[PDB]
Structure 1
Amino acid sequence: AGSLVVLGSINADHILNLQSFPTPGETVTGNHYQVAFGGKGANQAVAAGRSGANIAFIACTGDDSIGESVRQQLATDNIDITPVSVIKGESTGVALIFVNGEGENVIGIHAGANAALSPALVEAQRERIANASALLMQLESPLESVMAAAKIAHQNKTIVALNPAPARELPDELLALVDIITPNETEAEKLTGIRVENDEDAAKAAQVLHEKGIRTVLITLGSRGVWASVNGEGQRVPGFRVQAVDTIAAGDTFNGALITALLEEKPLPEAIRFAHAAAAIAVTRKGAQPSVPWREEIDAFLDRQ
């Protein structure tokens, strides 16, 4: 399997379980409270590394205590943490999260040191990006830096995979550089104009992304699995019906695991299956990163399926 470069955020997640999300001006008393490692970059890097990829992670942490001890934690998840830089005089990105009784979540992030991952730090990782087979990125890092890395990857034939989350509009210059894009429906709407309630809407939205230059488009459809479209021809690949308890890092786990299977030369339908299996384990557990499965558990899940 070739090498994977993940580039994205690292956060300290502050998670509170409650019955129901507080409404404006209301104070709710929750139950469980947890401070754990998260971030869309870290979560995908962990999911890639635990499922078996040969992955290196480009990220910025602050020099607080949490920043200084997340690198050590990430190194045990089978991730080369050499390109994780420690920004002096800055704190680690933070996430404040509410997880309700039905298991949905609401998330508010504060960039912190994730904002210091710049085009200069990306430009120092040119060779790593150039030699990699894939580059996986999200939108919790500065847009300039996602654009700079996509550019180096594009020149050097490194697959560029982008999980466009959280939702935002992206300029065509970035979109043209992407090979694999994995939006959810809110995100596919925000990038193309097309609301996505079904497979016809999904095929509509995918065609706009094919129009922008993106060959492989995967639109996740919540409980309905994913709309997989490779330059036009597209179909639905359902996930595993499972008992959701904590749906945080489900998307992240799917993206990291997805790229691992593709770097092991698994056809796309099979890479999606494998990723769906990692996500299905992840959501039956709590917290972002802690719910991420190792390769032997993904296999076992698949063997019984």
Structure 2
Amino acid sequence: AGSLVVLGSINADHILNLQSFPTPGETVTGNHYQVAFGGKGANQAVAAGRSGANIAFIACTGDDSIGESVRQQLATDNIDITPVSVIKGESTGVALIFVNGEGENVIGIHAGANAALSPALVEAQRERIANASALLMQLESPLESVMAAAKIAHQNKTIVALNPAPARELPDELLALVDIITPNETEAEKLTGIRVENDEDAAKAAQVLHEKGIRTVLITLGSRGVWASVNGEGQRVPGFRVQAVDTIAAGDTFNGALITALLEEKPLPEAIRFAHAAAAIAVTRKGAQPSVPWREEIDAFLDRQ
């Protein structure tokens, strides 16, 4: 099948489950603590890899021991880590995550080596990006780097897939180069200025994105699935119903598995189905990367449906 390049961050996630988020000056004690591999780019690369994509990963670790471990792990996740650079004198990214009794989380991130993923590292991968069928990125990498790689993909008819997370505003210049974008509700509001409270809102935020030049807009709607729109023709694809347990990286899982399905030439709806399945398994498991399902598991889930 087609060839995927993911470009994004790598973190070590520290996750503490608690009842309520601490308020300023406060101290709370948690009930479960976990250390695992995270980072939006790595989570997405792992969802692609484990889903069965031909994927290569552009990213940076620091020169430390954790960076060493994550590289070895990534290689076992069906990912070509040849373009994963090692930044001398730099530490591997870290995320500190609190998850409350509802399942809401807040996240603090130490960028470390992720900030060292520069336009010049992108340019060194020109050829790789020019030959890929698709390029998938998020916003935990330097914007200038996302922009440089989007330009190369566009020049070379590589599908640009952008998951605009974490939330922030983005220039028209970037948005015009994107073919598929996957905002959640907060992002869609941040990018279009339209608050997304229902399917009719979803279709409105989508329209503003189609006029920015983006043909395929998917607005994830949490447990309400996704609003999928292709130049203005839109419908909701409900997700599967499961006993959720951990939502971190659900969207990561969804993006990685979406692109995998699309590059197998499955049509959008079959592909969203594939993806919704993968995420639903993911929300029944703990942590980010440990939660990411394998193809066989995603295929066994769909048969059971």
Secondary structure of the corresponding residue to residue 55 of structure 1: strand
Structure 1 CA distance for aligned equivalents of residues 278 and 109 of structure 2: 25
Are the counterparts in 2 of residues 168 and 187 from structure 1 also a CA contact under 8 Å? yes
Deviation of 1:104 after TM superposition, in Å, equals 2.1
Are the counterparts in 2 of residues 161 and 179 from structure 1 also a CA contact under 8 Å? yes
Structure 2 CA distance for aligned equivalents of residues 104 and 296 of structure 1: 29
Structure 1 CA distance for aligned equivalents of residues 98 and 42 of structure 2: 19
Q: Deviations over 1:167-188 (max 9, x none)?
A: 1000000000000000001100
Secondary structure of the corresponding residue to residue 260 of structure 1: helix
Q: Deviations over 1:200-246 (max 9, x none)?
A: 11111000110000000000111111000001100000000111111
Are the counterparts in 2 of residues 133 and 159 from structure 1 also a CA contact under 8 Å? yes
Structure 2 CA distance for aligned equivalents of residues 20 and 143 of structure 1: 33
Are the counterparts in 2 of residues 102 and 245 from structure 1 also a CA contact under 8 Å? no
TM-score by length of 1: 0.99
TM-score by length of 2: 0.99
Partner of 1:10 in structure 2?
Answer: 10
Q: How many residues align?
A: 305
Deviation of 1:24 after TM superposition, in Å, equals 1.9
Q: Deviations over 1:16-42 (max 9, x none)?
A: 111221122210000221111100000
More displaced stretch, 104-113 vs 81-90: 104-113
Q: Deviations over 1:146-202 (max 9, x none)?
A: 000000000100100000000100000000000000000110000011110011111
Partner of 1:181 in structure 2?
Answer: 181
Structure 1 CA distance for aligned equivalents of residues 126 and 269 of structure 2: 31
Secondary structure of the corresponding residue to residue 108 of structure 2: strand
Q: Among the aligned pairs, what percent are the same residue?
A: 100
Structure 1 CA distance for aligned equivalents of residues 47 and 250 of structure 2: 10
Are the counterparts in 2 of residues 64 and 92 from structure 1 also a CA contact under 8 Å? yes
Structure 2 CA distance for aligned equivalents of residues 300 and 250 of structure 1: 19
Off by >3 Å, runs of 4+ in structure 1 = none
Deviation of 1:100 after TM superposition, in Å, equals 1.9
Structure 2 CA distance for aligned equivalents of residues 170 and 110 of structure 1: 22
Secondary structure of the corresponding residue to residue 60 of structure 1: strand
Are the counterparts in 2 of residues 67 and 92 from structure 1 also a CA contact under 8 Å? yes
Structure 2 CA distance for aligned equivalents of residues 45 and 195 of structure 1: 30
Residues 86-165 of structure 1 aligned to structure 2 (within 5 Å): 86-165=86-165
Deviation of 1:66 after TM superposition, in Å, equals 0.5
Partner of 2:254 in structure 1?
Answer: 254
